[PDB]
Write an enzyme that holds these catalytic residues in place. Sequence first.
Site, short mmCIF file in Angstrom:
data_model
loop_
_atom_site.label_atom_id
_atom_site.label_comp_id
_atom_site.label_asym_id
_atom_site.label_seq_id
_atom_site.Cartn_x
_atom_site.Cartn_y
_atom_site.Cartn_z
N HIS A 179 0.81 -1.22 0.00
CA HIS A 179 0.00 0.00 0.00
C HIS A 179 0.85 1.28 0.00
O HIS A 179 0.28 2.37 -0.11
CB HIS A 179 -1.07 0.02 1.10
CG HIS A 179 -0.54 -0.01 2.49
ND1 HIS A 179 -0.06 1.13 3.10
CD2 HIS A 179 -0.48 -1.04 3.37
CE1 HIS A 179 0.32 0.76 4.32
NE2 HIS A 179 0.10 -0.54 4.52
N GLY A 198 2.66 5.74 10.30
CA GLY A 198 4.06 5.70 9.87
C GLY A 198 4.82 4.48 10.35
O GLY A 198 5.97 4.26 9.96
N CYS A 252 4.02 1.48 9.56
CA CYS A 252 3.78 0.45 8.56
C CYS A 252 5.08 -0.11 8.05
O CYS A 252 6.01 0.65 7.82
CB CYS A 252 2.91 0.99 7.44
SG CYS A 252 1.17 1.15 7.90
C1 LIG Z 1 -3.33 8.58 6.39
O1 LIG Z 1 -3.27 7.34 7.08
C2 LIG Z 1 -4.52 6.95 7.61
C3 LIG Z 1 -4.38 5.49 7.99
O2 LIG Z 1 -5.07 5.03 8.89
N1 LIG Z 1 -3.50 4.76 7.28
C4 LIG Z 1 -3.03 3.37 7.42
C5 LIG Z 1 -1.60 3.30 6.86
C6 LIG Z 1 -3.10 2.90 8.91
O3 LIG Z 1 -4.17 2.65 9.45
N2 LIG Z 1 -1.92 2.69 9.53
C7 LIG Z 1 -1.54 2.72 10.89
C8 LIG Z 1 -0.79 1.68 11.43
N3 LIG Z 1 -0.69 1.37 12.73
C9 LIG Z 1 -1.31 2.17 13.58
C10 LIG Z 1 -2.05 3.31 13.22
C11 LIG Z 1 -2.56 4.23 14.17
C12 LIG Z 1 -3.17 5.38 13.76
C13 LIG Z 1 -3.32 5.66 12.41
C14 LIG Z 1 -2.85 4.80 11.46
C15 LIG Z 1 -2.19 3.60 11.83
C16 LIG Z 1 -3.94 2.45 6.60
C17 LIG Z 1 -5.30 2.70 6.54
C18 LIG Z 1 -6.14 1.87 5.82
C19 LIG Z 1 -5.63 0.78 5.15
CL1 LIG Z 1 -6.71 -0.27 4.32
C20 LIG Z 1 -4.27 0.53 5.19
CL2 LIG Z 1 -3.60 -0.85 4.38
C21 LIG Z 1 -3.42 1.35 5.92
#
Ligand SMILES: COCC(=O)N[C@@](C)(C(=O)Nc1cncc2ccccc12)c1ccc(Cl)c(Cl)c1
EC number: 3.4.19.12
Lengths: 305, 301
Positions: free
Chosen positions: B41, B143, B145
């Site tokens: 992603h 972040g 990820c």
């Molecule tokens: C702009 O980013 C928004 C967001 O939530 N993004 C991430 C990247 C997300 O969830 N990541 C996060 C990881 N680990 C704790 C997290 C605590 C808080 C927030 C975000 C976390 C996201 C979201 C939806 C999907 Cl389907 C995927 Cl694959 C990844």
Amino acid sequence: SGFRKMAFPSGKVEGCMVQVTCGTTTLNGLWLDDVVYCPRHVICTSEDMLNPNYEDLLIRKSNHNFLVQAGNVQLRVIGHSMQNCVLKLKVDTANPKTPKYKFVRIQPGQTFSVLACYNGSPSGVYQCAMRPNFTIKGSFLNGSCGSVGFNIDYDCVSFCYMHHMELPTGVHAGTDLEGNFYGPFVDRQTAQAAGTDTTITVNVLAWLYAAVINGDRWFLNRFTTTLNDFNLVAMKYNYEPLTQDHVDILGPLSAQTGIAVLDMCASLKELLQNGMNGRTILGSALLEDEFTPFDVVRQCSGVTF
Amino acid sequence: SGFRKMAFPSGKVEGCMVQVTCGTTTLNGLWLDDVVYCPRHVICTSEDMLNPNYEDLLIRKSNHNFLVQAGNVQLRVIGHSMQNCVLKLKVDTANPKTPKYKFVRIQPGQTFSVLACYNGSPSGVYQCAMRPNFTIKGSFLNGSCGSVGFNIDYDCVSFCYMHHMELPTGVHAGTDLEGNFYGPFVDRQTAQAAGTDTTITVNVLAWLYAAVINGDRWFLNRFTTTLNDFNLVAMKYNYEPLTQDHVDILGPLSAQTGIAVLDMCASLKELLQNGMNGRTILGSALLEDEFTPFDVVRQCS
Ligand SMILES: COCC(=O)N[C@@](C)(C(=O)Nc1cncc2ccccc12)c1ccc(Cl)c(Cl)c1
């Protein structure tokens, strides 16, 4: 989201762990530059542990009596000196993996990571607090002596603890890296007991702020308290007194959550008198006291090393 | 003596953490040999998240669109491929800090250490378990990820998890290092909910054996039970069924403590019925389920 007991990354300290052997005893040493630090009881066997004159035992030792092993490389000992309860073995090779480091003495309530080692080989890392009674509730087996406690400040490793012994209750005692013991403990075989422990109040309050940051608000109440009324209640439940320094330290968490420190104190006051009532805070049925206010900020903000 | 939640030393994994940037997104990558692994992603845009066609988005990317940073050194991407939900960026430098490693897919109840990173920089290490509902109760911020879950056994790092996302309940979902998700999760912004979690029974029993090894016997009782009677009671408290595999796995702890597995099962039923009564087991007022039978033996010998 989430709140875990988190230790600092142990890589910078793993590159410093060596195995120190002196006669029949094998413990861990901390190799920084051309010096290896380890508990001075390594020069002790059975009679050398009962009533030991360490200056007398050390003067009888020569450099070749200490076998120092860095992985599969034997380090040549070219000198030996003792500073308090730590032995310093001067070696011919400066550790190329030596990080930027400091020797710091911590205060009770402060947390640090412990890299548990056996035969100069790191086996685990965990986060623990210097108890108010000066013991650490560690996880150590025989051969762990010389395992170190540290904090990582930016790119600098602050060494604050060296494991020396286990008390009869299963708790641990050790020294700072200058060989000065934490607590009323001595490095020998005698009757030693850890004092009655108290809960680290500022740390419980920091952990309650972390619970609010994570969406757990059930314990919050409309009430506030005076610092004196809180300390009168805290003293009754074997909790450390909360000073104005602690109230100031909890200021940023208070600003972030919108809950005044004395308002959070009134929540802790109710929790001590009435209990959890089958409820949990951050997955715990007990009030956690091994997260400092800085640990909470560091984990709920995203600080890296 | 003592029983702590213990993570593996993270040094071998710290030397593999890199920062991966693709457009506006910056997450962590795992640099092993000349390949950098990261969640796929990282190539996703704003409108390409609810229903992203990853093959279509990846074919549009070139090697210079990915900025990989190992400390203060920019690595050069010379290839890109996708294996399930992981992106693999072939680079022009083999990581000299690459340890002896394996990619292992773990089963629910298995534990591992997590090295949480932000911008390719390790910030902390912790222990956790693959929940029966295939989520991990981690501590992650945006972040993080690409942060990885690992075990270290005899000089070899077994990579078992890569963080991909946070579910609406605050729990985390991710994949093995081959990009296969644990659980019924997908890397889309669609409505996804973790199934109701259950307690890992074999792990609680292992932790009760660790308590006995450490001198805590208050919870022991004169009773034994049948495996079927135990499972009938266990399911009522949302505990995972205990299989004959679990009973076999707990055999060495049973031999070391002299308490038969089904006798320890009867202790657990009583703990479930009565609660702790203001008492603690290994410093806990709850029954701990994030220590495997392998973790208990490792830490107590
Ligand atoms: C702009 O980013 C928004 C967001 O939530 N993004 C991430 C990247 C997300 O969830 N990541 C996060 C990881 N680990 C704790 C997290 C605590 C808080 C927030 C975000 C976390 C996201 C979201 C939806 C999907 Cl389907 C995927 Cl694959 C990844």
